[PDB]
């Protein structure tokens, strides 16, 4: 009576007092447990399942079914007890002070006769009074459990069923694996509808029927490490507690989705009017620090506007791009600009140095090492950067220097949006923007022909068909051949590159202003169609940056306003 | 009460005594913690973050938010304890001593009900009090944390969140990862300007505003083994600790931190 | 901190039982510069084994008595601490942790302790593992708030393998590079130590012995460092003179070097 009270929670009395949350659905398994409990010799259902799928809710749903009368007449009016093994070990010091107290439990179950133990965390049972080859709480129960004179529901995480129950398979015999599967999206809506009363009352805020349809769909596709009948409750309560935090109304689709935006980082909430103007102004905001490259700025702006409107495929990344073209025209400048639009900084860009994968065996940097190898404690240099940041821009910088077997690790990345690491954890790339910059010059062909962007687009498109397999270019959304930077585009890149040099001078409490004669001279000495914007970058370094670096050290230009004037031109 | 005082330190009482340094910024991060702590079930946040970004400082910002009363009413008059897991393993030679000490903690928390049990280094919970035949402190807390009858803040390095909380996938469910990010440089200047009086008082030096602006920009540009809200304080300290050294007031300036950073990485700045 | 797991180096320096430290005056200032910090005031002494890392701290413990403190290191006792001696005797649970929480309780109550722990490669994994409770989990909350001043000592490889591979341990110990001393610095070490070696062996060590001990040790011995392989030569030669009995010269330290290395004559 009170022997079980001081070592276990009376879960049947918790259902009479209404302390248990209403278990709506998973009643095809409550009847499955009662089919196991009504057996003769081994009547001990272990509820195995992924962590969070409601394994301990089924027994809470069972203990409610005891007092509702839903229970059959073979388990009618049976007091269920969640036996705390930690409370049995506590209060022991000496030899026998665990094993006596567990025999006090089973003497009462023999006496009282309507007791169904619930060993929550049945993996705790092995090694509970001593080691596995000694008298512990497992070895005491094993004569009782195989006879059928002790009914004991277990619940174990599936990962912890293979590690502790299956490791000593004599205990695995005494229990029946009652597979508690993860709810579907349609099933966890009506789980949330029954749980709505307990969370509307605690948070003092209403919860819309749409918000639980939202918290089921948004928890399914945008969470890929938790399980549904728990990760949907997380969106309800954190939005339920967000509403009672600010009021110290109701919970909408937007209230759920802005919780998930603060939990993953993925902007899944309905865009406000101030922000969605920037989404339509994405090209013009990307053109603030990229110049030209208009077909590429459109192409990566279409991928994000498709993502924010919610028209992207839920089983694919947000965008898969290959930035091919001549070197220096802004293949990596744009991938930093796209990572500054989405975040604010360009070190939020996941730059994968893909040129240092030239070995045919550095693919283990992308998904970690397999079991049996150090580099198993590290999940990988790519999977663990997206397990943390699911909404990312993952730049694969200069892909054409790697081996062909690094591309093959990235096939399912592009089509399925998955990349399972070596330690067995799939990582969603479904919300990343996968950029593959390829650097694939002389202003003639080889031989006799009649001929920039003309006879270069069809050239590099056939050099991607030659270097890649046609299954990789199949999975890439858009391949954008990049323009060589024209003369009128180098003039505007002077304005971009000088404004960082002048930005370096704002810390020196001065400012640099250039004349139109001098910006033209830097552009005339910085133009090269085959190497573009780095010879402009070197010209400003050779004629502006170092000559002002000397004149700072002469004290010739201190914090006064230096204007760089042309020497002579025309 | 007395049971929690011998197994941990009250951070709320430490915030009344002014022993916790000011947390300038982190308003949206403590708001996320108090959002998670106000849940009905699984009201357990984890400040995951890069090592040194102020994970334990966010909770120090919470302990002085309770004293100031800037918390919501569901977290008003909470006593925030840093649970010393070494204090629980200490003196647990015999079977069931650790499990007694942990259930005595939880009996006091269910009694009072105003306890937020901050467990710093939550990766140490998996294997806490784990012996040949024992019950680890994870499996004792897992029924408490899942039902929301134990408010518990964790603080774990992202590296130490893979190896010990994602290798225990049951315990990862019981918590909520509150990503404490590496702050921007302009946020770090406000961190440093808020910590100006604590390092003025201990190093006995005046630290000018440009020195705070330098030591955030100089640390971010020239130090990569640490994170912003720490490698910037690191340059403020060895600035001012050298002035306690060589003088056995002198202002800390841009020159006083650049000569620290020059003697730090070997980079002449 | 009890005298059970270490000893008071400042009480030894007050009684003058520590070695006179000639040289390393710049390194002691860098230790005082790290110890004078409000937070993270934990100088790890990175140097090759036997370059004088304890001799930095033995000179630092003298500087507490000599009054070279920055007034935040004034009247601070400096208990050394063998971290492995707390490990020794632990086969059961809470043996290491009780003896580690006791010595941290005796710092909060006393209030002027500066621990010198050597072997910080032992710190990571002092208990069972990192997910278990080790000394690289108990010290860390107090090593970030400046409430615990621990002076470390690694090699450079132990610092790379155990601290630089440990997240959130790089930021709590601040590196102080105790370099390998030159040959003239090593002679000046031996000039300061000779009042101990001539009074212990009751011999007279000539000036020609030390200029040879700083040269022959670099010339013939490469598995071990100078400010120890040169101290050893004039140590054993004083013992060999006490055994054969008195004056040590470059002929008395000569046959001492010939004893070890495979030199027949």
């Amino acid at each position: 009576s009170l022997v079980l009270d001081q070592f276990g929670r009376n879960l049947t009395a918790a259902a009479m007092e209404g302390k248990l949350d209403p278990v709506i659905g998973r009643e095809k398994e409550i009847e499955r447990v009662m089919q196991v409990l009504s057996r003769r010799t081994k009547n001990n259902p272990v509820l195995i399942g992924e962590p969070g799928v409601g394994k301990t809710a089924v027994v809470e749903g069972l203990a409610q079914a005891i007092v509702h009368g839903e229970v059959p007449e073979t388990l009618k009016d049976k007091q269920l007890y969640t036996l705390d093994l930690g409370s049995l070990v506590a209060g022991s010091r000496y030899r026998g002070d665990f094993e006596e107290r567990l025999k006090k439990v089973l003497k009462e179950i023999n006496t009282r006769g309507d007791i169904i133990l619930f060993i929550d965390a049945l993996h705790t049972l092995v090694g509970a009074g001593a080691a596995e080859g000694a008298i512990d709480a497992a070895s005491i129960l094993k004569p009782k459990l195989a006879r059928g004179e002790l009914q004991t529901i277990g619940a174990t995480t599936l990962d912890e069923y293979r590690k502790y129950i299956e490791k000593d398979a004599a205990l695995e015999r005494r229990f029946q694996p009652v597979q508690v599967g993860e709810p579907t999206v349609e099933h966890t809506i009506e789980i949330l509808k029954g749980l709505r009363d307990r969370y509307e009352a605690h948070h003092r805020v209403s919860i819309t029927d749409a918000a639980m349809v939202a918290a089921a769909t948004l928890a399914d596709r945008y969470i890929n490490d938790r399980f549904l009948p728990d990760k949907a409750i997380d969106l309800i309560d954190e939005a339920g507690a967000r509403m009672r935090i600010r009021r110290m109304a109701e919970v909408d689709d937007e209230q759920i989705a802005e919780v998930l935006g603060n939990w993953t980082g993925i902007p899944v909430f309905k865009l406000t009017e101030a922000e969605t103007t920037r989404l339509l102004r994405m090209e013009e905001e990307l053109h603030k620090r990229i110049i030209g490259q208009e077909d590429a700025v459109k192409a990566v702006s279409k991928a994000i506007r498709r993502t924010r409107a919610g028209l992207k495929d839920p089983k694919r990344p947000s965008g898969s791009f290959i930035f091919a073209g001549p070197s220096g025209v802004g293949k990596t400048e744009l991938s930093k600009a796209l990572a500054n639009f989405l975040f604010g900084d360009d070190d939020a860009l996941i730059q994968i140095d893909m040129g240092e994968f030239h070995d045919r065996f550095t693919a283990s940097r992308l998904f970690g090492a397999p079991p049996g190898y150090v580099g198993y404690e590290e999940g990988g240099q790519l999977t663990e950067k997206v397990r943390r940041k699911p909404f990312s821009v993952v730049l694969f910088d200069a892909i054409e220097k790697a081996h062909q077997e690094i591309y093959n690790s990235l096939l399912q990345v592009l089509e399925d949006g998955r990349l399972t690491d070596g330690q067995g954890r799939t990582v969603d790339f479904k919300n990343t923007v996968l950029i593959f910059t390829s650097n694939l010059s002389k202003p003639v062909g080889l031989g006799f022909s009649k001929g920039d962007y003309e006879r270069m687009k069809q050239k590099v498109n056939d050099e991607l068909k030659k270097h890649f397999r046609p299954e990789f270019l199949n999975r890439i959304d858009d391949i954008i051949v990049f323009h060589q930077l024209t003369r009128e585009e180098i003039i505007r890149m002077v304005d971009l590159m000088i404004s960082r040099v002048a930005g370096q001078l704002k810390s020196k409490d001065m400012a640099l202003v250039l004349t139109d004669a001098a910006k033209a001279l830097l552009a005339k000495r910085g133009f090269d169609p085959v190497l573009g914007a780095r010879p402009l970058r070197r010209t400003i370094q050779r004629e502006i940056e170092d000559q002002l670096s000397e004149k700072i050290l002469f004290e010739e230009v201190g914090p006064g306003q230096v204007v760089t004037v042309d020497v002579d031109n025309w | 009460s007395l049971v929690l005082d011998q197994f941990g330190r009250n951070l709320t009482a430490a915030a009344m005594e002014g022993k916790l340094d000011p947390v300038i910024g982190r308003e949206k991060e403590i708001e996320r913690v108090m959002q998670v702590l106000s849940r009905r079930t699984k009201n357990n946040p984890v400040l995951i973050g890069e090592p040194g970004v102020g994970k334990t400082a966010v909770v120090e910002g919470l302990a002085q938010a309770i004293v100031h009363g800037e918390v919501p009413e569901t977290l008003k008059d909470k006593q925030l304890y840093t649970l010393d897991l070494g204090s629980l393993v200490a003196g647990s030679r015999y079977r069931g001593d650790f499990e007694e000490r942990l259930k005595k903690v939880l009996k006091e928390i269910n009694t009072r009900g105003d306890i937020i049990l901050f467990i710093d280094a939550l990766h140490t919970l998996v294997g806490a009090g784990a012996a040949e035949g024992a019950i680890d402190a994870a499996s004792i807390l897992k029924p408490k944390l899942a039902r929301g009858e134990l408010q518990t803040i964790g603080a774990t390095t992202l590296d130490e969140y893979r190896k010990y909380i994602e290798k225990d996938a049951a315990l990862e469910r019981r918590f909520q990862p509150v990503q404490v990010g590496e702050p921007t440089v302009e946020h770090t200047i406000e961190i440093l300007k808020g910590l100006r009086d604590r390092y003025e008082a201990h190093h006995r030096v005046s630290i000018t505003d440009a020195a705070m602006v330098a030591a955030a920009t100089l640390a971010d540009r020239y130090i990569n083994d640490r994170f912003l809200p720490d490698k910037a304080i690191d340059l403020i300290d060895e600035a001012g600790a050298r002035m306690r050294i060589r003088r056995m007031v002198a202002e800390v300036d841009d020159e006083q931190i650049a000569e620290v950073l020059g003697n730090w990485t070997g980079i002449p700045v | 901190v009890l005298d059970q797991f270490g000893r008071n180096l400042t009480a030894a320096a007050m009684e003058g039982k520590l070695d006179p430290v000639i040289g390393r005056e710049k390194e002691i200032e860098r230790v005082m510069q790290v110890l004078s910090r409000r937070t993270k005031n934990n100088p790890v002494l990175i140097g090759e084994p036997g370059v004088g890392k304890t001799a930095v701290v033995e000179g630092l413990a003298q500087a507490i008595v000599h009054g070279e403190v920055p007034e935040t290191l004034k009247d601070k006792q400096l208990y050394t601490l063998d971290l492995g001696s707390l490990v020794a005797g632990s086969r059961y649970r809470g043996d290491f942790e009780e003896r580690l929480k006791k010595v941290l309780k005796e710092i909060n109550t006393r209030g002027d302790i500066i621990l010198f722990i050597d072997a910080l490669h032992t710190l990571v994994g002092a208990g069972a593992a990192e997910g278990a409770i080790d000394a690289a989990s108990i010290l860390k909350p107090k090593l970030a708030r400046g409430e615990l001043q621990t002076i470390g000592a690694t090699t450079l490889d132990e610092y790379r393998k155990y601290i630089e591979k440990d997240a959130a341990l790089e930021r709590r110990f601040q590196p102080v590079q105790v370099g390998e001393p030159t040959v003239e610095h090593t002679i000046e070490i031996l000039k300061g130590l000779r009042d101990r070696y001539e009074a212990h062996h009751r011999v007279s060590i000539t000036d020609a012995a030390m200029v040879a001990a700083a040269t022959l040790a670099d010339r013939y011995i490469n598995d071990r460092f100078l400010p120890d392989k040169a101290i050893d030569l004039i140590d054993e030669a004083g013992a060999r003179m006490r055994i054969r009995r008195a004056e040590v010269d470059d002929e008395q330290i000569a046959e001492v070097l010939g004893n070890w290395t495979g030199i027949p004559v």
Binding site: D97 | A134 | Y92, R93
Partner: peptide, 24 residues
Amino acid sequence: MKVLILACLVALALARELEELNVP
């Protein structure tokens, strides 16, 4: 070059708790 590192994980050297023999 393609020489594999062989992690070679040790068995857990762990602590032991105690049943104690009661005395007066």
